PDB file of all heavy atoms in Angstrom:
ATOM      1  N   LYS O 234      -1.202  10.829 -11.610  1.00  0.00           N
ATOM      2  CA  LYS O 234      -0.167  10.869 -10.715  1.00  0.00           C
ATOM      3  C   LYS O 234      -0.601  10.313  -9.290  1.00  0.00           C
ATOM      4  O   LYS O 234      -1.575  10.767  -8.729  1.00  0.00           O
ATOM      5  CB  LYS O 234       0.452  12.289 -10.418  1.00  0.00           C
ATOM      6  CG  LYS O 234       1.697  12.366  -9.563  1.00  0.00           C
ATOM      7  CD  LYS O 234       2.472  13.626  -9.660  1.00  0.00           C
ATOM      8  CE  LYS O 234       1.584  14.835  -9.114  1.00  0.00           C
ATOM      9  NZ  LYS O 234       1.383  14.732  -7.518  1.00  0.00           N
ATOM     10  N   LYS O 280      15.862  21.160 -15.433  1.00  0.00           N
ATOM     11  CA  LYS O 280      15.747  22.700 -15.358  1.00  0.00           C
ATOM     12  C   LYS O 280      16.852  23.217 -16.387  1.00  0.00           C
ATOM     13  O   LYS O 280      16.416  24.036 -17.197  1.00  0.00           O
ATOM     14  CB  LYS O 280      16.016  23.152 -14.067  1.00  0.00           C
ATOM     15  CG  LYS O 280      14.989  23.054 -13.035  1.00  0.00           C
ATOM     16  CD  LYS O 280      15.427  23.464 -11.644  1.00  0.00           C
ATOM     17  CE  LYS O 280      15.897  24.997 -11.506  1.00  0.00           C
ATOM     18  NZ  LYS O 280      14.781  25.772 -11.853  1.00  0.00           N
ATOM     19  N   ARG O 283      15.568  22.322 -19.924  1.00  0.00           N
ATOM     20  CA  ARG O 283      14.372  23.066 -20.242  1.00  0.00           C
ATOM     21  C   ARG O 283      14.720  24.568 -20.548  1.00  0.00           C
ATOM     22  O   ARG O 283      14.226  25.033 -21.508  1.00  0.00           O
ATOM     23  CB  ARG O 283      13.235  22.955 -19.291  1.00  0.00           C
ATOM     24  CG  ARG O 283      12.651  21.551 -19.277  1.00  0.00           C
ATOM     25  CD  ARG O 283      11.850  21.097 -18.027  1.00  0.00           C
ATOM     26  NE  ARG O 283      11.319  19.954 -18.213  1.00  0.00           N
ATOM     27  CZ  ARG O 283      10.189  19.427 -17.575  1.00  0.00           C
ATOM     28  NH1 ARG O 283       9.510  20.292 -16.837  1.00  0.00           N
ATOM     29  NH2 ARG O 283       9.656  18.262 -17.829  1.00  0.00           N
ATOM     30  N   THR O 292       9.849  24.756 -25.945  1.00  0.00           N
ATOM     31  CA  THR O 292       9.450  24.546 -24.618  1.00  0.00           C
ATOM     32  C   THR O 292       9.245  23.021 -24.390  1.00  0.00           C
ATOM     33  O   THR O 292       8.588  22.356 -25.293  1.00  0.00           O
ATOM     34  CB  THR O 292       8.217  25.278 -24.187  1.00  0.00           C
ATOM     35  OG1 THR O 292       7.881  24.942 -22.760  1.00  0.00           O
ATOM     36  CG2 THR O 292       7.019  25.050 -25.094  1.00  0.00           C
ATOM     37  N   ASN O 294       7.965  19.904 -21.827  1.00  0.00           N
ATOM     38  CA  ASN O 294       7.358  19.316 -20.627  1.00  0.00           C
ATOM     39  C   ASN O 294       7.437  17.812 -20.719  1.00  0.00           C
ATOM     40  O   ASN O 294       8.085  17.198 -21.480  1.00  0.00           O
ATOM     41  CB  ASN O 294       6.014  19.895 -20.506  1.00  0.00           C
ATOM     42  CG  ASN O 294       4.950  19.544 -21.534  1.00  0.00           C
ATOM     43  OD1 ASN O 294       5.225  18.548 -22.246  1.00  0.00           O
ATOM     44  ND2 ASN O 294       3.881  20.310 -21.688  1.00  0.00           N
ATOM     45  N   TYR O 296       5.211  15.870 -21.757  1.00  0.00           N
ATOM     46  CA  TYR O 296       4.359  15.246 -22.646  1.00  0.00           C
ATOM     47  C   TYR O 296       4.996  15.533 -24.117  1.00  0.00           C
ATOM     48  O   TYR O 296       4.766  14.609 -24.966  1.00  0.00           O
ATOM     49  CB  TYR O 296       2.974  15.946 -22.735  1.00  0.00           C
ATOM     50  CG  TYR O 296       2.258  15.879 -21.339  1.00  0.00           C
ATOM     51  CD1 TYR O 296       2.122  16.938 -20.589  1.00  0.00           C
ATOM     52  CD2 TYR O 296       1.881  14.613 -20.905  1.00  0.00           C
ATOM     53  CE1 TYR O 296       1.508  16.977 -19.280  1.00  0.00           C
ATOM     54  CE2 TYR O 296       1.361  14.622 -19.631  1.00  0.00           C
ATOM     55  CZ  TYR O 296       1.034  15.715 -18.910  1.00  0.00           C
ATOM     56  OH  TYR O 296       0.518  15.589 -17.681  1.00  0.00           O
TER      57      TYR O 296
ATOM     58  P    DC T   5      11.031  32.542 -18.414  1.00  0.00           P
ATOM     59  OP1  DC T   5      10.891  31.733 -19.587  1.00  0.00           O
ATOM     60  OP2  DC T   5       9.790  33.033 -17.661  1.00  0.00           O
ATOM     61  O5'  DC T   5      12.018  31.973 -17.327  1.00  0.00           O
ATOM     62  C5'  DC T   5      13.340  31.702 -17.753  1.00  0.00           C
ATOM     63  C4'  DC T   5      14.144  31.303 -16.505  1.00  0.00           C
ATOM     64  O4'  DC T   5      14.450  32.445 -15.625  1.00  0.00           O
ATOM     65  C3'  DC T   5      13.589  30.221 -15.565  1.00  0.00           C
ATOM     66  O3'  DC T   5      14.557  29.213 -15.342  1.00  0.00           O
ATOM     67  C2'  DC T   5      13.249  31.006 -14.360  1.00  0.00           C
ATOM     68  C1'  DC T   5      14.379  32.027 -14.316  1.00  0.00           C
ATOM     69  N1   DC T   5      14.224  33.263 -13.521  1.00  0.00           N
ATOM     70  C2   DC T   5      15.289  33.680 -12.725  1.00  0.00           C
ATOM     71  O2   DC T   5      16.421  33.175 -12.807  1.00  0.00           O
ATOM     72  N3   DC T   5      15.097  34.631 -11.851  1.00  0.00           N
ATOM     73  C4   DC T   5      13.951  35.265 -11.658  1.00  0.00           C
ATOM     74  N4   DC T   5      13.840  36.285 -10.875  1.00  0.00           N
ATOM     75  C5   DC T   5      12.769  34.769 -12.450  1.00  0.00           C
ATOM     76  C6   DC T   5      12.977  33.857 -13.249  1.00  0.00           C
ATOM     77  P    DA T   6      14.108  27.925 -14.492  1.00  0.00           P
ATOM     78  OP1  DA T   6      13.415  28.212 -13.307  1.00  0.00           O
ATOM     79  OP2  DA T   6      15.322  27.076 -14.432  1.00  0.00           O
ATOM     80  O5'  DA T   6      13.183  27.087 -15.480  1.00  0.00           O
ATOM     81  C5'  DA T   6      13.611  26.734 -16.827  1.00  0.00           C
ATOM     82  C4'  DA T   6      12.617  25.770 -17.503  1.00  0.00           C
ATOM     83  O4'  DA T   6      12.333  24.740 -16.640  1.00  0.00           O
ATOM     84  C3'  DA T   6      11.145  26.368 -17.612  1.00  0.00           C
ATOM     85  O3'  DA T   6      10.685  25.773 -18.773  1.00  0.00           O
ATOM     86  C2'  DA T   6      10.314  25.999 -16.386  1.00  0.00           C
ATOM     87  C1'  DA T   6      11.054  24.522 -16.086  1.00  0.00           C
ATOM     88  N9   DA T   6      11.170  24.390 -14.720  1.00  0.00           N
ATOM     89  C8   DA T   6      11.488  25.225 -13.599  1.00  0.00           C
ATOM     90  N7   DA T   6      11.600  24.625 -12.454  1.00  0.00           N
ATOM     91  C5   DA T   6      11.296  23.251 -12.775  1.00  0.00           C
ATOM     92  C6   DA T   6      11.418  22.185 -11.873  1.00  0.00           C
ATOM     93  N6   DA T   6      11.666  22.180 -10.538  1.00  0.00           N
ATOM     94  N1   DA T   6      11.143  20.952 -12.402  1.00  0.00           N
ATOM     95  C2   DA T   6      10.905  20.926 -13.750  1.00  0.00           C
ATOM     96  N3   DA T   6      10.819  21.874 -14.708  1.00  0.00           N
ATOM     97  C4   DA T   6      11.136  23.079 -14.039  1.00  0.00           C
ATOM     98  P    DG T   7       9.243  26.229 -19.377  1.00  0.00           P
ATOM     99  OP1  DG T   7       9.302  25.832 -20.886  1.00  0.00           O
ATOM    100  OP2  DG T   7       8.921  27.558 -18.924  1.00  0.00           O
ATOM    101  O5'  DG T   7       8.307  25.255 -18.664  1.00  0.00           O
ATOM    102  C5'  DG T   7       8.251  23.901 -19.198  1.00  0.00           C
ATOM    103  C4'  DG T   7       7.395  23.018 -18.381  1.00  0.00           C
ATOM    104  O4'  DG T   7       7.953  22.962 -16.991  1.00  0.00           O
ATOM    105  C3'  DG T   7       5.960  23.638 -17.998  1.00  0.00           C
ATOM    106  O3'  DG T   7       5.051  22.769 -18.732  1.00  0.00           O
ATOM    107  C2'  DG T   7       5.733  23.475 -16.600  1.00  0.00           C
ATOM    108  C1'  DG T   7       6.914  22.629 -16.145  1.00  0.00           C
ATOM    109  N9   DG T   7       7.296  22.754 -14.717  1.00  0.00           N
ATOM    110  C8   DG T   7       7.389  21.663 -13.932  1.00  0.00           C
ATOM    111  N7   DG T   7       7.839  21.970 -12.604  1.00  0.00           N
ATOM    112  C5   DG T   7       8.021  23.297 -12.628  1.00  0.00           C
ATOM    113  C6   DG T   7       8.376  24.310 -11.703  1.00  0.00           C
ATOM    114  O6   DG T   7       8.681  23.895 -10.516  1.00  0.00           O
ATOM    115  N1   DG T   7       8.377  25.486 -12.120  1.00  0.00           N
ATOM    116  C2   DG T   7       8.082  25.898 -13.357  1.00  0.00           C
ATOM    117  N2   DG T   7       8.175  27.225 -13.748  1.00  0.00           N
ATOM    118  N3   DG T   7       7.730  25.072 -14.323  1.00  0.00           N
ATOM    119  C4   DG T   7       7.652  23.793 -13.995  1.00  0.00           C
ATOM    120  P    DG T   8       3.544  23.065 -18.817  1.00  0.00           P
ATOM    121  OP1  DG T   8       2.831  22.470 -19.962  1.00  0.00           O
ATOM    122  OP2  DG T   8       3.133  24.398 -18.315  1.00  0.00           O
ATOM    123  O5'  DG T   8       3.086  22.017 -17.519  1.00  0.00           O
ATOM    124  C5'  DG T   8       3.248  20.584 -17.685  1.00  0.00           C
ATOM    125  C4'  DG T   8       2.878  19.980 -16.391  1.00  0.00           C
ATOM    126  O4'  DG T   8       3.710  20.401 -15.284  1.00  0.00           O
ATOM    127  C3'  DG T   8       1.400  20.320 -16.069  1.00  0.00           C
ATOM    128  O3'  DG T   8       0.787  19.100 -15.489  1.00  0.00           O
ATOM    129  C2'  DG T   8       1.520  21.300 -14.923  1.00  0.00           C
ATOM    130  C1'  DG T   8       2.831  20.704 -14.223  1.00  0.00           C
ATOM    131  N9   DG T   8       3.469  21.703 -13.234  1.00  0.00           N
ATOM    132  C8   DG T   8       3.704  23.102 -13.473  1.00  0.00           C
ATOM    133  N7   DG T   8       4.250  23.542 -12.432  1.00  0.00           N
ATOM    134  C5   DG T   8       4.568  22.463 -11.532  1.00  0.00           C
ATOM    135  C6   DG T   8       5.073  22.453 -10.298  1.00  0.00           C
ATOM    136  O6   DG T   8       5.565  23.286  -9.614  1.00  0.00           O
ATOM    137  N1   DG T   8       5.140  21.225  -9.772  1.00  0.00           N
ATOM    138  C2   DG T   8       4.546  20.076 -10.297  1.00  0.00           C
ATOM    139  N2   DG T   8       4.736  18.960  -9.627  1.00  0.00           N
ATOM    140  N3   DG T   8       3.964  20.116 -11.562  1.00  0.00           N
ATOM    141  C4   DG T   8       4.057  21.365 -12.145  1.00  0.00           C
ATOM    142  P    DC T   9      -0.675  18.706 -15.599  1.00  0.00           P
ATOM    143  OP1  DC T   9      -0.802  17.870 -16.833  1.00  0.00           O
ATOM    144  OP2  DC T   9      -1.452  19.886 -15.401  1.00  0.00           O
ATOM    145  O5'  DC T   9      -0.792  17.815 -14.372  1.00  0.00           O
ATOM    146  C5'  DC T   9       0.031  16.594 -14.179  1.00  0.00           C
ATOM    147  C4'  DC T   9      -0.037  16.071 -12.861  1.00  0.00           C
ATOM    148  O4'  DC T   9       0.676  16.710 -11.803  1.00  0.00           O
ATOM    149  C3'  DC T   9      -1.586  16.026 -12.314  1.00  0.00           C
ATOM    150  O3'  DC T   9      -1.758  14.782 -11.528  1.00  0.00           O
ATOM    151  C2'  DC T   9      -1.697  17.280 -11.451  1.00  0.00           C
ATOM    152  C1'  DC T   9      -0.292  17.363 -10.863  1.00  0.00           C
ATOM    153  N1   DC T   9       0.143  18.773 -10.635  1.00  0.00           N
ATOM    154  C2   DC T   9       0.715  19.083  -9.497  1.00  0.00           C
ATOM    155  O2   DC T   9       1.002  18.170  -8.506  1.00  0.00           O
ATOM    156  N3   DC T   9       1.302  20.338  -9.148  1.00  0.00           N
ATOM    157  C4   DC T   9       1.088  21.158 -10.211  1.00  0.00           C
ATOM    158  N4   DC T   9       1.558  22.412  -9.887  1.00  0.00           N
ATOM    159  C5   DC T   9       0.370  20.938 -11.341  1.00  0.00           C
ATOM    160  C6   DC T   9      -0.054  19.656 -11.633  1.00  0.00           C
ATOM    161  P    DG T  10      -3.172  14.423 -11.128  1.00  0.00           P
ATOM    162  OP1  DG T  10      -3.246  12.860 -11.154  1.00  0.00           O
ATOM    163  OP2  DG T  10      -4.190  15.127 -11.855  1.00  0.00           O
ATOM    164  O5'  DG T  10      -3.242  14.868  -9.733  1.00  0.00           O
ATOM    165  C5'  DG T  10      -2.487  14.309  -8.726  1.00  0.00           C
ATOM    166  C4'  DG T  10      -2.681  14.839  -7.375  1.00  0.00           C
ATOM    167  O4'  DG T  10      -2.120  16.164  -7.293  1.00  0.00           O
ATOM    168  C3'  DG T  10      -4.245  15.104  -6.992  1.00  0.00           C
ATOM    169  O3'  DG T  10      -4.163  14.522  -5.582  1.00  0.00           O
ATOM    170  C2'  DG T  10      -4.493  16.419  -7.114  1.00  0.00           C
ATOM    171  C1'  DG T  10      -3.110  17.073  -6.704  1.00  0.00           C
ATOM    172  N9   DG T  10      -2.813  18.373  -7.327  1.00  0.00           N
ATOM    173  C8   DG T  10      -3.151  18.788  -8.607  1.00  0.00           C
ATOM    174  N7   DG T  10      -2.670  20.035  -8.871  1.00  0.00           N
ATOM    175  C5   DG T  10      -2.049  20.403  -7.643  1.00  0.00           C
ATOM    176  C6   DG T  10      -1.317  21.617  -7.346  1.00  0.00           C
ATOM    177  O6   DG T  10      -1.115  22.620  -8.125  1.00  0.00           O
ATOM    178  N1   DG T  10      -0.876  21.569  -6.048  1.00  0.00           N
ATOM    179  C2   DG T  10      -1.029  20.514  -5.132  1.00  0.00           C
ATOM    180  N2   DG T  10      -0.549  20.651  -3.927  1.00  0.00           N
ATOM    181  N3   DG T  10      -1.578  19.304  -5.456  1.00  0.00           N
ATOM    182  C4   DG T  10      -2.061  19.383  -6.702  1.00  0.00           C
ATOM    183  P    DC T  11      -5.590  14.512  -4.750  1.00  0.00           P
ATOM    184  OP1  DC T  11      -5.539  13.312  -3.776  1.00  0.00           O
ATOM    185  OP2  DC T  11      -6.806  14.518  -5.656  1.00  0.00           O
ATOM    186  O5'  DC T  11      -5.521  15.771  -3.967  1.00  0.00           O
ATOM    187  C5'  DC T  11      -4.574  16.096  -2.893  1.00  0.00           C
ATOM    188  C4'  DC T  11      -4.690  17.460  -2.360  1.00  0.00           C
ATOM    189  O4'  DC T  11      -4.257  18.335  -3.349  1.00  0.00           O
ATOM    190  C3'  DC T  11      -6.135  17.803  -2.080  1.00  0.00           C
ATOM    191  O3'  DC T  11      -6.230  17.924  -0.512  1.00  0.00           O
ATOM    192  C2'  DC T  11      -6.333  19.153  -2.704  1.00  0.00           C
ATOM    193  C1'  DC T  11      -4.973  19.578  -3.230  1.00  0.00           C
ATOM    194  N1   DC T  11      -4.988  20.371  -4.436  1.00  0.00           N
ATOM    195  C2   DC T  11      -4.220  21.557  -4.471  1.00  0.00           C
ATOM    196  O2   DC T  11      -3.773  21.929  -3.525  1.00  0.00           O
ATOM    197  N3   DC T  11      -4.268  22.256  -5.631  1.00  0.00           N
ATOM    198  C4   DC T  11      -4.932  21.734  -6.822  1.00  0.00           C
ATOM    199  N4   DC T  11      -4.777  22.475  -7.818  1.00  0.00           N
ATOM    200  C5   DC T  11      -5.624  20.531  -6.765  1.00  0.00           C
ATOM    201  C6   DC T  11      -5.583  19.822  -5.582  1.00  0.00           C
TER     202       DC T  11
END
Side-chain angles (χ1 to χ4, degrees):
Chain O
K234 185 170 64 72
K280 287 173 57 66
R283 289 164 175 206
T292 178
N294 63 22
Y296 308 109

